[PDB]
Amino acid sequence: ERTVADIMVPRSRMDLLDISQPLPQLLATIIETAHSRFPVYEDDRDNIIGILLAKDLLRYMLEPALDIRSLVRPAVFIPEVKRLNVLLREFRASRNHLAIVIDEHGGISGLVTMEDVLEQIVGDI
Amino acid sequence: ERTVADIMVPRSRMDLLDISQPLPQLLATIIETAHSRFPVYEDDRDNIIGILLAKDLLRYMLEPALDIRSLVRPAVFIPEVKRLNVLLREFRASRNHLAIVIDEGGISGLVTMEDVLEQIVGDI
Ligand SMILES: Nc1ncnc2c1ncn2[C@@H]1O[C@H](COP(=O)(O)O)[C@@H](O)[C@H]1O
């Protein structure tokens, strides 16, 4: 059956956020992209420190001293070889619908979402 | 063969935003619910006038006096009798993947591309 590697967004195509950027710059980057969720890095683009849901930045208006770093949630890292039918079940049961994909040696390969899985599964039927 | 009415999110489960509501009240609702898109009404919950993408509110922090109305995008209203295979084609042919569902019109619910795909995968 198919694997994550067949459907992932490749590493080179990922829209990422650098945690060291000032807020006004982060906002501009996010607004320019039509995605809701961003892997976040620090110091090197493969040094992923989590996932930011864009809408969480609205808490700037609800907390006097918002630390953006505290909004970054742990990423789910999944292997390239993970099969789609199992991943679908995982995503459906989970609060996280975006995973970072890693190769057989642990390198960052890409990202994948529940939508990508559903589309490929339906595309094969 | 299956229709939108089979799989739609019922009216009662729809997270709607009153566009006239004070900013702090809007923010509280948008943050606490795990949705990216919200149908917006004015005056009457029946009067859905478009859809707000949560992330578009991030503009407020650059322009706090913006007309929030200016962020609202037009809605699409489809009949609940529409067939799922037709909707899937139509959604794939489009950038907009959320529709408001109207009865035999009055609002009866909402449906996304994800809902359509989930149903098709469950019918394998
Ligand atoms: N941060 C991102 N960088 C690149 N592609 C993404 C990102 N987030 C989501 N995607 C991809 O874009 C599609 C739509 O996701 P979304 O934009 O979050 O609705 C996903 O199903 C993936 O195909």
Ligand SMILES: Nc1ncnc2c1ncn2[C@@H]1O[C@H](COP(=O)(O)O)[C@@H](O)[C@H]1O
């Ligand atoms: N404003 C909303 N109110 C109620 N349900 C929604 C709303 N937006 C999306 N949904 C449903 O929840 C699912 C997840 O969408 P989202 O929360 O936008 O990722 C969709 O496929 C719809 O079934």
